[PDB]
Ligand binder design. Structure first.
Ligand SMILES: *[C@@](C)(CO)[C@](*)(O)[C@H](CC(C)C)NC(=O)[C@H](Cc1ccccc1)NC(=O)[C@H](CC(C)C)NC(=O)[C@H](CCc1ccccc1)NC(=O)CN1CCOCC1
Ligand SMILES: [Mg+2]
Lengths: 233, 222, 240, 212, 235, 231, 250, 244
């Protein structure tokens, strides 16, 4: 039995024609206090997988160490560690999914929602979700927390089903992700303006973008809004 | 306080014919009022002409299917590649479920296939392992909507022979695979209309002596 | 814990520790079991190098396992107490769960199983004891007589003897006991048992113990004078 | 559930309904609530479905092991006590079982044992167990005599379940009849309440509360 | 002394090889498999005439479809039979079916090498496990204390094993009837036994799909013994 | 002599005699052959019987859909080690959704056998194994020895008179390695290889045992009338 | 790994001897002479400080040890074995007595606990017997003054006066001539120094001799005041100077 | 491994004897003689101390005779340290029985349990047996006055008069000669001392080389009293019988 202390908010993601995109803001909230601002919640594993984590940050750091250790363990007695026997996104996910469900079964969960985004060795896009309960699911778009409520609707307008994936380019897909992050900054009280974004492409590989900011915001209309009903001044 | 269970919604349906059996289930996965996936399959081919679904709490459902699939694998290793009969699978699943009697798998399990005489078989389980062979069973969120319809259309309940003064019952007969799939599709479209957790897509797994075939149909996405 | 495998096989296929446990039985005082038509009688030798004994309090050779079953033995006396205690506990445990007292075969099978377990368990030596278990099954009038030994094998006997000079008394019983017609009465059965012990014992004074078991938990031990009457009768008929 | 079994001149009658519920939801109308442990032993099941079925199938395995080891069929007393000692170990853990171990042996004769999940074990001539036990008792007690014929005893057992199936909301479906003799148990058919009620109403002239 | 689980220079476990010598001292047991059933027969060998021979239990039921005969230190077989019975019943509980004869034999043979410094020494008894299942039909297995088991069409174990096995080599064919097999066991037992064969010092049994495992009465075996003697004198 | 009482003792020349005696049990065992191409890997095993009335001891065991081995020596020890491999293959599947590499399979067996050679009370395994498999880096063949030493090879053979088959494969190396996309020809080469270890006896229908795994071929074992093709 | 020696290393020989105990007693025989004498108003225990090297500081090595405030101990045999026994003896006085009864154990019972420890080293698995004989002098309210010997077997005997180790045979004879039931404590100390001079070969002074007494209570050595019932330890170790004072009037 | 150094204390000889038990009995045969004599109105326990030294404290000493409870006592022959281990166990066992049943433990039950402990050391555990033989002297309301003996084998037997330790063969012959069933305590006291006086390896039997005890009903009305004799009381009883 736990309660989460230092927490990370939404992680959002989607598939596009050649790969996957995933994003998450750089905030570590302490209740209503926006305590830590330099927190990286996207953690790359190799050059073909990115694990995005929301929820308790102490448990996130534990999971970082596990993934870091997984890379080390895989390299042991493995001449093809950087080739055929490298870590796949599906291997990394199944490992985490096993841990998450084992921990919930011992009534001592890792208080997180996790999205494993990556590209397999055969070029196939990988995007799957797992949380503190060990619940797993996959979809063309995936999001956690407020992202599930606000981002998914916007991302599903681009990729509503499987057949829309080949029709979606990396430019269009990233534009939708960046737009979603802005909407979350408008509407999520535990979000920040600063965020990180990662693209895993089957051709161009892993592109990790840090220190992005929400921009092109609409605030000007606020000056016209006065009172709560009858006020004119 | 931490709650180890959750409700992933969805609904499943098993019907048995003379020389076949179907196990259907919608592909929608949910939590509360949010959709997690419009296509997340929960009906699985487990080998030996056995199809299985464990609807309810998906994490427990996946765990169970995973364990049974593994049970089938070890049954081959320990007993000279012998085929696991549907009745033997059912009893094995009871012990899997009852093994966690005091921390249950929150799922309604249904398996389908052919018995040792080659006839269609559907077994259904409660969360802690009580099981029963039936011609017909619906499970999950919309089970209460679908099941009485199945009683009426599959087992011909409350249907009497016209003009016999309610004295002669409508005679029981096996349904064709074509007629069964019609009932499955109509059951799921009806359930989709009146149950919020049911929709998106329908995936049916048909089991004959030839093997396991699949069919997919769209459902309303609202 | 002490793990050493003490009972092990030898090149010729023998477990010497079990076989040496049989030598301890061969050293022990003679014990005999004879079953009649409606009874079983357990006879036991007591060596007469021990005078100044207190026969009131000295452990008796025949032990009641339950009200309907008895156990005598030959070999190490200290070892026999452990088997008797275990058997008595199992007798009460059986009544508790099955709601019925043990059969003589079941009780023998249990005791024999305990003896066997000590022949292939680490850190222990075999029991230097062979037992004669006798009695009547619940609601049954057919007499039962079984034998066990250190190896763990057990079997039923019409009549049997164990201990020192048992091969002499077994020779006696083999020609004197008729399968077609066993001792019809209690007197006949006791006499044959006493006769058989008189081939080996020495004197028929305070050397022979006799215990008679009859159906429906009817067990009684004979006194010195009662036994002495059989000894006096047999010797007078012998001089012929 | 409604289950009963009573002892009489011609052996033992055992009768059960076939309904299973999850709250007010009628989950099944075709459940087998008599478990055939061997040709001479029967067990009834009321309460938690899984608990009864799992532990009574297990009981059958323990009874099979007994006759292998002892070269003799287990007594009804010993069989019932294996089950009662088992549930007693789980006392407080939340098992829900109301069962009756019915059978014949040479030493005992026809015997019925009531066994439940809080450890109670009772030998007796008449028992009714389940949510509709009281309804079954009402009809059974008021018509019971030791000198009933096999035909009349079978009917009374059937009629008693029907009575409970009618009044008790959590009982119904169909009636399963068994008759236990010195030669073993004999199955006397599945009787759907749907047809049995109207058949009984018309022939017997009973159930005047219902609109005919 | 020396370790219990020690290898000899030839590459064999000393204790396993010594336990095999103990089995050679044991009473004879013979098994013959046919398409109509499997027959199991044993030499009782009472150590004295006062011993009631019917209490000598060297043929044993494991389940309705599996039977077992033993030879060697027969006391060691009790825990093996107990395990076999539990394994058989347990599998029926878990899978609502009869357990394969081979799978049962494998379960028994897993105990064999669970000794060392687990139990203190290997078993000093060999088993002939006979049974029937739907897949592989009528089967006969020879389970040793080495942990190894061979399937056999016919097999003899015990003191007269090598002489009996050579006889079974000539006599066995794939079209043997059950009645022919019964007589063949009695014939070969009478040849290797020390004392003269009769219904009291020898025991027969069989396993058939229809009637399951059955130990024969002394009355039934006596007639088969009489039938056997007449047939040998008839030519 | 004085240094062969247990596995925990070194001889004066640095030898472990109990391990060497375990190695001797393999030499007494029936011959078995392993070989591979780039697409497929094949196990061929000569089964042994007690007599004409007995069955033929099964030499080949399946570990997973993509991996299995053949045995030579103590069969129960092969059952223990194969069971361990089945579990390790299975652990890799359930936890990582990943088919166990044949190389890791060898590393795991090596480490399991080693622990039994350094501790008092226990004994070395008395069996040699030939593991074949097809994983993400193609076809593989391993040779396990109970000393702990595992070796990846193109082809090999263990058991009695295994030197004949091992010499043949050493000559045939350049031929059979390039038998790609042709199962029956790779088996033929293996059957001809094991034939170089035969004396007085020949390959019959219930004597020969063959197994194969490859690119689009799950690990499957052939016995009885299914191997009549290759005689 | 793990302690596989779960069996006795001390066993009966055909003649009925327990070899390891006999051999342990032989080790005690080789050991340096120590002695104890019981007076009417006290007890004295004494021994020679055999120095391993002249560079070694013999003050750091204490052959005579305080067990409780009213009980002291000295030995002959293997020094290391003695050191750990003193540690265990001190602890057992607390765990099995003082923490239960709120007072220190009487001499006989503490001796009994030490004897038990030494007996277990004679029968328990994978251990040898202790290679020491102890002399334990002490006082308690209901038994008065007492002196005990404890052997490797675990056997203990009460003594009026005795000696153990190298020259014990001659020393015991010397004590038989001098001992009477009217000896005062100072007379017992004098006899102890005379007896010990016979066995000592080299230097004989306060620096080479270790000597302690169980006598009157010492309020000055208590360390605090305010509780009338607490009057201070009866055990006192004689200083190097205090010994030399008595060696002049010898 | 450690197998090399294992004596194997719990095994049989080819003749079917327990080596260690036999060798433990050989050890006990060199111990100071202890005699028990049971009379109709009490029991006597007499024991000879092992070669005493003149500087041994005699009054505050206990070597041979120990008290188990108010109704039962034992005489020891063998290793004293071993005996004390067993005595404390026996004292605890008696108190467990009293706590459980609110009744003093019957003599045989205490003897059996102590003898069962000895048996265990001969059958399992790989440890050496206790080199001790007891003479149990006690009273209960079932059998009255009782004498038992136990030895390292764990075998126990009841007696009217018995000796353990050294010179039992000679001692038992003398007891068998002069003992009779209608004997009194005061007569038994005299027999015990006379027997030791003849069987002793010492020159002359004196008070300082003896331990003595009686269990009489000599207290006031239907109750048992244990008397462990003081040095001066032994000196007086030795003069009263005319040995010194
Ligand atoms: C009469 C009919 C009254 O109960 C009888 O007593 C029968 C006896 C027969 C079935 C052997 N008893 C029941 O029908 C019994 C009543 C009951 C319910 C719950 C606890 C105790 C007793 N019903 C069951 O046991 C049902 C049988 C199903 C329908 C096949 N099972 C459940 O209700 C299950 C498991 C209950 C459970 C026990 C212990 C731990 C956890 C769960 N529960 C569900 O299926 C829950 N629910 C059903 C509705 O859909 C959402 C999930
Ligand atoms: Mg809907």
């Amino acid at each position: 039995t736990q309660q989460p202390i230092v927490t990370g908010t939404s992680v959002i993601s989607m598939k596009y024609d050649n790969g996957v995109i995933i994003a998450a803001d750089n905030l570590g909230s302490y209740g209503s206090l926006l305590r830590f601002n330099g927190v990286e919640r996207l953690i790359p594993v190799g050059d073909n997988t990115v694990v995005g984590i929301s929820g308790d940050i102490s448990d996130m750091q534990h999971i970082e160490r596990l993934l870091k250790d997984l890379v080390t363990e895989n390299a042991y007695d493995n001449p093809l560690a950087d080739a055929e026997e490298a870590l796949e996104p599906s291997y990394i996910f199944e490992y985490l999914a096993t841990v998450m469900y084992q921990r919930r079964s011992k009534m001592n969960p890792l208080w997180n929602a996790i999205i494993v985004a990556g590209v397999q060795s055969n070029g196939d896009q990988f995007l799957r979700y797992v949380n503190l309960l060990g619940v797993t699911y996959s979809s063309p778009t995936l999001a956690t927390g407020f992202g599930a409520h606000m981002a998914n609707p916007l991302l599903r307008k681009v990729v509503d089903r499987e057949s829309d994936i080949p029709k979606t380019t990396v430019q269009v897909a990233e534009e939708a992700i960046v737009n979603a992050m802005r909407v979350l900054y408008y509407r999520d009280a535990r979000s920040s303006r600063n965020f990180s974004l990662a693209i895993i492409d089957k051709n161009t590989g892993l592109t990790f973008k840090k220190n992005l900011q929400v921009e092109n915001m609409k605030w000007d209309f606020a000056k016209d809004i006065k009172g709560y009903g009858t006020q004119k001044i | 306080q931490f709650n180890p269970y959750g409700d992933n919604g969805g609904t499943i349906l098993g019907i048995a014919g003379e020389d076949f059996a179907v196990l259907a289930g919608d592909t929608r996965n949910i939590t509360d009022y949010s959709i997690n996936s419009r296509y997340e399959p929960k009906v699985f081919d487990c080998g030996d002409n056995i199809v299985m679904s464990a609807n309810g709490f998906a994490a427990d459902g996946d765990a169970l299917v995973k364990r049974f699939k593994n049970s089938v694998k070890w049954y081959h290793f320990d007993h000279n590649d012998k085929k696991l009969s549907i009745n033997s699978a059912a009893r094995n699943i009871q012990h899997l479920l009852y093994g966690k009697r005091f921390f249950p798998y929150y799922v309604h399990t249904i398996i389908a296939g052919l018995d040792e005489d080659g006839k269609g078989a559907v077994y259904s389980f409660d969360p802690v392992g009580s099981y029963e062979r039936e011609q017909c069973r619906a499970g999950g969120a919309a089970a209460s909507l679908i099941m009485p319809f199945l009683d009426n259309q599959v087992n011909f309940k409350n249907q009497y022979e016209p003009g016999t003064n309610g004295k002669v019952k409508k005679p029981l007969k096996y349904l064709s695979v074509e007629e069964v799939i019609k009932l499955v599709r109509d059951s799921f479209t009806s359930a989709t209309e009146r149950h919020i957790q049911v929709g998106d897509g329908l995936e049916i797994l048909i089991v004959t002596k030839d093997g396991v075939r699949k069919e997919f149909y769209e459902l309303k996405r609202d | 814990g002490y793990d050493r495998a003490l009972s092990i096989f030898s090149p010729d296929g023998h477990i010497f520790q079990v076989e040496y446990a049989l030598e301890a039985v061969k050293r022990g005082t003679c014990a005999v079991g004879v079953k009649g038509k409606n009874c079983v009688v357990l006879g036991c030798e007591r060596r007469s190098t021990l005078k100044l004994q207190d026969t009131r309090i000295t452990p008796s050779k025949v032990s009641k396992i339950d009200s309907h079953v008895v156990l005598s033995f030959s070999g190490l006396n200290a070892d026999s107490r452990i088997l008797i205690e275990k058997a008595r506990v199992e007798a009460q445990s059986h009544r508790l769960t099955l709601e019925d007292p043990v059969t003589v075969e079941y009780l023998t099978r249990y005791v024999a199983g305990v003896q066997q377990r000590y022949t292939q368990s680490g850190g222990v030596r075999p029991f230097g004891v062979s037992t004669l278990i006798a009695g009547f099954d619940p609601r049954d009038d057919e007499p039962k007589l079984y034998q066990t030994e250190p190896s763990g094998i057990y079997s039923s006997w019409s009549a049997q003897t164990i201990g020192r000079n048992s091969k002499t008394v077994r020779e006696f019983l083999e020609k004197n006991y008729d399968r077609k017609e066993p001792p019809a009465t209690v007197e006949e059965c006791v006499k044959l048992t006493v006769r058989s012990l008189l081939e080996v014992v020495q004197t028929g004074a305070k050397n022979i113990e006799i215990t008679v078991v009859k159906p429906d938990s009817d067990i009684v031990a004979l006194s010195s004078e009662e036994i002495n009457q059989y000894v006096t009768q047999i010797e007078q008929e012998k001089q012929e | 559930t409604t289950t009963l079994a009573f002892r009489f001149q011609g052996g033992i009658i055992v009768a059960v309904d076939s309904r299973a519920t999850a709250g007010n939801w009628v989950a099944s109308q075709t459940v087998k609530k008599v478990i055939e442990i061997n040709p001479f032993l029967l067990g009834t099941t009321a309460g938690g479905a899984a608990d009864c079925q799992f532990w009574e199938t297990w009981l059958g395995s323990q009874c099979r092991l007994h006759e292998l080891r002892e070269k003799e069929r287990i007594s009804v007393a010993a069989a019932s006590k294996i089950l009662s000692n088992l549930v007693y170990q789980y006392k407080g853990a939340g098992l829900s079982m109301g069962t009756m171990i019915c059978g014949y042996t040479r030493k005992e004769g026809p015997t019925i044992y009531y066994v439940d999940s809080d450890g109670t074990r009772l030998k007796g001539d008449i028992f009714c167990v389940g949510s509709g036990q009281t309804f079954a008792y009402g009809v059974l007690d008021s018509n019971y005599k030791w000198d009933l014929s096999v035909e009349d005893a079978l009917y009374l057992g059937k009629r008693s379940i029907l009575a409970a199936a009618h009044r008790d909301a959590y009982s119904g479906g169909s009636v399963n009849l068994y008759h236990v003799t010195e030669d073993g148990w004999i199955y006397h058919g599945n009787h759907d309440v749907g047809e049995l009620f109207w058949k009984v109403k018309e022939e017997e002239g009973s159930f005047n509360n219902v609109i005919g | 002394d020396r370790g219990v689980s020690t290898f000899s220079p030839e590459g064999r476990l000393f204790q396993v090889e010594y336990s095999l010598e103990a089995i050679k001292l044991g009473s004879t047991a013979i098994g013959i498999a046919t398409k109509e059933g499997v027959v199991l027969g044993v030499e009782k060998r009472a150590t004295s005439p006062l011993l009631e021979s019917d209490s000598i239990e060297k043929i044993v039921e494991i389940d309705r479809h599996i039977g077992c005969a033993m030879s060697g230190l027969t006391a060691d077989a009790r825990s093996m039979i107990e395990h076999a019975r539990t394994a058989a019943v347990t599998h029926n509980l878990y899978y609502d079916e009869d357990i394969n004869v081979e799978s049962l034999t494998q379960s028994v043979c897993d105990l064999a090498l669970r000794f060392g410094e687990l139990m203190s020494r290997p078993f000093g008894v060999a088993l002939l496990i006979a049974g029937h299942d739907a897949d592989d039909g009528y089967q006969l297995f020879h389970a040793e204390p080495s942990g190894t088991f061979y399937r056999y069409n016919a097999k003899a174990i015990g003191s007269g094993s090598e002489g009996a096995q050579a006889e079974l080599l000539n006599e066995w064919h794939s079209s043997l009837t059950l009645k022919e097999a019964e007589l063949l066991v009695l014939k070969i037992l009478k040849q290797v036994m020390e004392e003269k064969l009769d219904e009291n010092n020898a025991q027969l049994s069989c396993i058939t799909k229809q009637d399951g495992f059955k130990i024969y009465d002394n009355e039934k075996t006596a007639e088969l013994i009489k039938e056997l003697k007449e047939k040998e004198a008839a030519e | 002599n004085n240094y062969d009482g247990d596995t925990v003792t070194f001889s004066p020349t640095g030898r472990l005699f109990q391990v060497e005696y375990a190695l001797e049990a393999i030499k007494q065992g029936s011959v078995t052959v392993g070989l591979r191409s780039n697409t497929h890997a094949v196990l061929v095993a000569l089964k042994r019987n007690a007599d004409e009335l007995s069955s033929y001891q099964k030499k080949i065991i399946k570990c997973d859909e993509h991996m299995g081995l053949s045995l030579a020596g103590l069969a129960p020890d092969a059952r223990v080690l194969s069971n361990y491999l089945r579990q390790q293959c299975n652990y890799s599947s359930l936890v990582f959704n990943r088919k166990l590499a044949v190389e890791r399979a060898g590393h795991l067996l090596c480490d399991k056998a080693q622990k039994n050679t350094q501790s008092y009370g226990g004994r070395p395994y008395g069996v040699g194994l030939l593991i074949i498999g097809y994983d993400k880096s193609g076809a593989h063949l391993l040779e396990f020895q109970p000393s702990g030493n595992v070796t990846e090879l193109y082809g090999t053979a263990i058991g009695a008179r295994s030197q004949g088959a091992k010499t043949y494969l050493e000559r045939t190396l350049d031929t059979f390695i390039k038998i790609d996309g042709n199962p029956d020809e790779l088996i033929k080469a293996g059957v001809e290889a094991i034939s170089q270890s035969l004396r007085d006896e020949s390959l019959t229908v219930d004597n020969l045992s063959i197994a194969i795994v490859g690119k689009d071929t799950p690990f499957t074992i052939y016995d009885g009338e299914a191997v009549a093709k290759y005689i | 790994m793990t302690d596989r020696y779960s069996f006795s290393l001390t066993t009966f020989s055909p003649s009925g001897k327990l070899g390891q105990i006999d051999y342990a007693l032989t080790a005690v025989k080789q050991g340096v002479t120590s002695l104890g004498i019981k007076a009417t108003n006290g007890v004295v225990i004494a021994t020679e400080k055999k120095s391993s090297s002249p560079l070694a500081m013999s003050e750091t090595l204490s052959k005579v040890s305080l067990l409780t405030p009213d009980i002291g101990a000295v030995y002959s045999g293997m020094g290391p074995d003695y050191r750990v026994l003193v540690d265990k003896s001190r602890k057992v006085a607390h765990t099995s007595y003082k923490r239960i009864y709120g007072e220190y154990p009487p001499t006989k019972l503490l001796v009994s606990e030490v004897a038990k420890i030494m007996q277990e080293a004679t029968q328990s698995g994978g251990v040898r017997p202790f290679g020491v004989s102890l002399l334990i002098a002490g006082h308690d309210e209901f038994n008065g003054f007492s002196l005990y010997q404890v052997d490797p077997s675990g056997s203990y005997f009460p003594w009026k006066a005795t000696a153990i180790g190298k020259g014990s045979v001659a020393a015991k004879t010397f004590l038989e001539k001098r001992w009477n039931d009217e000896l005062e404590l100072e007379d017992a100390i004098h006899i102890a120094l005379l007896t010990l001079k016979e066995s000592v070969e080299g230097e004989f002074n306060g620096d080479t001799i270790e000597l302690a007494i169980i006598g009157d209570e010492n309020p000055d050595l208590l360390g605090y005041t305010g509780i009338p019932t607490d009057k201070g330890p009866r055990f006192r170790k004689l200083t190097s100077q205090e010994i030399n004072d008595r060696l002049e009037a010898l | 491994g450690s197998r090399r150094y294992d004596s194997r204390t719990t095994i049989f000889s080819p003749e079917g004897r327990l080596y260690q038990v036999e060798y433990a009995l050989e050890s006990i045969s060199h111990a100071g003689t202890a005699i028990g004599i049971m009379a109709s109105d009490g029991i006597v326990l007499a024991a000879e101390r092992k070669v005493t030294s003149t500087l041994l404290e005699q009054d505050t000493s206990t070597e041979k005779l120990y008290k188990l409870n108010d109704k039962i006592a034992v005489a020891v022959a063998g290793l004293t340290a071993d005996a004390e281990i067993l005595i404390n166990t026996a004292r605890i066992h008696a108190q467990n029985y009293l706590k459980t049943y609110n009744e003093d433990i019957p003599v045989e039950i205490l003897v059996r349990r102590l003898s069962d402990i000895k048996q265990g050391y001969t059958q399992h555990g790989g440890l050496r047996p206790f080199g001790v033989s007891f003479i149990y002297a006690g009273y209960d309301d079932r059998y009255g006055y009782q004498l038992y003996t136990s030895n390292p084998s764990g075998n126990y037997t009841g007696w009217k008069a018995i000796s353990v330790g050294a010179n039992t063969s000679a001692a038992q012959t003398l007891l068998q000669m002069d003992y009779k069933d209608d004997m009194k305590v005061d007569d038994a006291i005299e027999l015990a001392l006379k027997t030791l006086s003849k069987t002793t390896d010492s020159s002359a039997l004196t008070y300082d080389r003896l331990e003595f005890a009686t269990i009489r009903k000599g207290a006031n009305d239907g109750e048992v009293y244990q008397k462990i004799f003081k040095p001066q009381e032994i000196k007086d009883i030795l003069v009263k019988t005319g040995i010194t």
